[PDB]
Design a protein around this ligand. Sequence first.
Ligand code: SF4
Ligand code: SF4
Ligand code: SF4
Ligand code: FES
Ligand code: ZN
Lengths: 118, 99, 114, 51, 125, 95, 205, 112, 178, 206
Amino acid sequence: SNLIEVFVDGQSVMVEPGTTVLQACEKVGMQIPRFCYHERLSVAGNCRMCLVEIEKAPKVVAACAMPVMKGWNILTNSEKSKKAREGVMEFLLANHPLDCPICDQGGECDLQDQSMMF
Amino acid sequence: ASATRVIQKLRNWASGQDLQAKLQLRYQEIAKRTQPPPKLPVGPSHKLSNNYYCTRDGRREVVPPSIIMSSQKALVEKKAVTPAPPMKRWELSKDQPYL
Amino acid sequence: TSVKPIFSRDLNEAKRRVRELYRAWYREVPNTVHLMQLDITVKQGRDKVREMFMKNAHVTDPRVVDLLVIKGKMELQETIKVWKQRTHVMRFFHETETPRPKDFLSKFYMGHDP
Amino acid sequence: EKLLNIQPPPRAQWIRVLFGEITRILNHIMAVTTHALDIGAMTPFFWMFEE
Amino acid sequence: QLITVDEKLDITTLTGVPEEHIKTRKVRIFVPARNNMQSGVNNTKKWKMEFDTRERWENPLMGWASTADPLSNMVLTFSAKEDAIAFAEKNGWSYDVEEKKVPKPKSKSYGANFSWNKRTRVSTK
Amino acid sequence: GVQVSPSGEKITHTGQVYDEKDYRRVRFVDRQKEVNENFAIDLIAQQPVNEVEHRIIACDGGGGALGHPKVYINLDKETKTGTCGYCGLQFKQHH
Amino acid sequence: EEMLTNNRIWRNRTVDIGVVTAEDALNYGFSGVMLRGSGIQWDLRKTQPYDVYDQVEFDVPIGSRGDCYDRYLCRVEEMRQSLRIIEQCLNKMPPGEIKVDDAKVSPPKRAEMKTSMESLIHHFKLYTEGYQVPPGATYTAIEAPKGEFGVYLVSDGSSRPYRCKIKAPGFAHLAGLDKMSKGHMLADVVAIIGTQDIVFGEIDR
Amino acid sequence: LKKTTGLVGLAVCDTPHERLTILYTKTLDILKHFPKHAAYRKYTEQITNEKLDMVKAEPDVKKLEALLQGGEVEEVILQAEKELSLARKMLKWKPWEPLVEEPPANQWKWPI
Amino acid sequence: TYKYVNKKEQESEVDMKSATDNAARILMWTELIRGLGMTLSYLFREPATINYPFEKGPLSPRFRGEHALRRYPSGEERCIACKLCEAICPAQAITIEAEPRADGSRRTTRYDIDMTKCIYCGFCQEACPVDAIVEGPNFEFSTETHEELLYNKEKLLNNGDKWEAEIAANIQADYLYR
Amino acid sequence: RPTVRPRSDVTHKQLSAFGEYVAEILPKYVQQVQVSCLDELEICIHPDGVIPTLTFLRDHTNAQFKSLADLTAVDVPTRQNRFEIVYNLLSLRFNSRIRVKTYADELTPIDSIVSVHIAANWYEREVWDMFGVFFFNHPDLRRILTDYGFEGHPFRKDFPLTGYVELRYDDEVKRVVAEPVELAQEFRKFDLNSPWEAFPAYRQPP
Ligand code: SF4
Ligand code: SF4
Ligand code: SF4
Ligand code: FES
Ligand SMILES: [Zn+2]
């Protein structure tokens, strides 16, 4: 009934169409990192931090934009879904000026964590 | 120091062992202050390749415990069991056995 | 609700177990005040005691009452002996701190105290 | 370290044992001697508290 | 053996808490807000039960800030709202609940930024 | 080398002196008010601008392991200059 | 030891004093010096080794004839047999690293937080937020001079703990104070305190 | 022959193979009261018969130790008294009763 | 390895050769002499006392003592209100309320220590990413009032305006070392 | 792999199989034996069967756990039986440990173990001082740590850090008197609990 079988490390989820992989994974709790995305602004994959290995794929997808089709199993804590992040945050942190103590957003930075977490 | 080569024999006769060589306190030939500045060693993973966080993350290799009854979920000849071999009576302390 | 009971059944059996304790505190105001000197004579000490049992009369649960006897026995077991001092026994009274206005009108000339 | 699941490195483990049995030497000296003070012997106390 | 009773389950005598911090002490049960600076949301999923606030005067010597109510910095993490009220009623405190604020499931189609007909035709890609 | 109230008390880095109608000045009676005369805002303008080459550089606080994490600046402003929030230095582009 | 351990005033002030029964110690859980001083062969450093104690070649000075002179001789020789441990813990120190390689569980090199960005952020969150342990629980242990000092640390995903607890080994030694001083007078009760090692701060919380 | 144990308070009370037998034999004889299906009963038999095959065969105590692992036999003797009380103290208890008294939900899921 | 501290009781056929040697260890006292003649040695030894205010003892350049706010070599207060030198301070000892400086820059209006708090633990000198706060060799700063220890900031600069001649040599031997 | 505290897989099975050994032998009052990745055992039970499992563990050859180390009381003020009370023992003969924990409300007393382990003479009592959890058959229950006039049970999570009293010397009466609590600095509760679970596959779905 306008619902699609989707898998997240084995979950038997059902979701409306036109939904991202986030809006699926967000149900369970596999909260994906985010820099280009907001829950209310238009979609634009520029950060390329929300990557994940969909099961049975050589290429990853920007989950912010990639909608969700039947039979797709995600691997959020794969090696390939963390290599995709340890690299990314290790790119951002090459033009960033180390100003955290100067920075107004010390504990309210959504990057300091997401360099720690992943 | 200024031990006049008699009281040493008074100390040692009154105490025992020749203790001018193993005296109480320190004078010299120790800790010649301002040792040079050291260039430390570095730890591993300063190696720039085959160095991810996945092959070092100590805290994501843990998992929840492995429950074995789970009074509603699992709830599931045979030999006796102990948590280990009953370990040994050790030894009897060679080179200083009875002190 | 089919609870485990402890030391008694429905209240009116626990109410004599109470009185075993008042049966001690009522006879251990005069022994304390003399053995370790104090200011109270004997009486306002006894008023304070009953003023504590006429704080917990609102209780209606046997398990709670069977518990509150115990903490009274401890303080009794601490009071019957000299393990306390002249500062602990005379601590209940709230002698020093000014009692706040129980009314409304004087209660907010000092303090945002609803 | 159990919870985090880490063995610290050897050199730090190694010194953690060294002071880990100099502190052993302390409390003995503090309860060999104080066990002698309150029994009465006040001298070895001072012989050690330069040591 | 067992005994029957159906009562309110009061405990307020077994804590001290003499008179002021029993009655005249509201309590707020809620799911804390998403710190809108951060897009991270793990501070939700819980039912913190912080209490109201009272005077925080200025210590006239140092400029320090000081208080009278020790019962002000009193976070408590719970797991379900049905359990929170049972905990606060068990100590007689006038709970004041706020409900969850679930966000909606919204449809966000990337291509619809790039419509012919429609009005969502974004600029700057 | 500080500025002083009409009541006669010493001002800090910040304007901090109590008004006349203030019982706080008691604590200075038969004592004195500790103060540092070394206002940073006075010392720092008494420092020449380092007129370097290329538009972008690194700064430090006199020793790379010894202060001022290596922040950079874009020195495109010929009108004003560029600062580093740690220090209070200033820079130009030379061109 | 020239002076005390053949001293009448020591020995008959100390010997036959506070006779501890072996199997009763365990009922009280002394589990430090105060049982090995009655012949219960035991030491975590060799019976449940954790750190680099695995290669030290040392010894445990058991005490028989439970009394506060054979506790005393244990307390002496445990001072000596650090020096076998030191000499072995001294002449083979490996060159290596300190403050574990991971920057999430250790702060980084102070010269390295100051250029390399990531080492700065961790330095900004270690010393504000911290480790972010996993939930779980342990009961560690270590034989300090007192005995089985150990911690029942209990955790939660928040950076902060959730009811740590400290196992004060003296805490049980002192509960046995009023059983081992039975048929003995005052003056040795002083000695009982010293040969239970009341470094109060363990006892106090 | 054995002068003293390493322990203290645990006296000698010599002549093993004598008090060790009578204790084990009685444990089995206290058993035959339990159910066959109560799982306690079908393990101690493996403990004691294992231990008793080795005392009933070997007269040498030195080699009897390191053979029923746990040395200082008189600690093993005391350990048999220790077993003995457990059985008779546990018949009045009932470990083999039916299923648990059903604790409440979400009573051990730790991370909170 | 387990070592009997005291296992020497064996019936050695105690004869008059030796059993009276214990009586020679007794009534003609010798073990007491042995414990006495020792002590007599030390009074002929070098007493390790020192005339403190004229002879002060040894320290090392990492000694945790009195705090001080350092300053750059060109004026310019080195502290910049990061607010992790209290978030780590386990004593909860500190309040460092801050603002812009009126230069547009970033500095404090407030800085504090209760030195009766401040366990002198060393977290703040090392957590400071700038070495703006440090913990210097003063340990003669006992005062007669609990109030004169509540160092605000002007003391704690002009203290840092004092030992900077000293700290910049201990730290000179302690950079490249932590 | 260097920095991961090597697992030493084998003793999990010893403590797992032995974990089963205690269940099927004692199926009454025993729920969810388990074990963490840290090879250390945990056994949750019902309060009516406290002793008969202890005495199995003090008195049985295959479970010589005749030495007690702690008896704490852990708060969970969101369930019914908020107070998880924990035991933890040790074999001198088998060289391993265990953990035997239970539960209680603010009033569902637990019969004590002092006939079994007298080591718990005072560990039991602090819980009475620190949480107000009565025990049956315990000799001379009374306060340990708190003042002789301290109401409350402070290690409860309901009791604030700085409690409800502070003492001082009011010279008019020549005593160390108490009056209500009046700070000078106000301990500053921080929100150091970031987002980002940090531990997936280890968590709570709604
Ligand atoms: S707080 Fe975040 S945004 Fe600010 S400097 Fe640090 S990493 Fe960059
Ligand atoms: S002392 Fe250091 S860490 Fe603290 S605010 Fe100043 S510069 Fe920042
Ligand atoms: S030394 Fe430690 S306790 Fe003292 S102010 Fe610094 S961080 Fe706080
Ligand atoms: S978070 Fe930027 S592409 Fe998805
Ligand atoms: Zn700069």
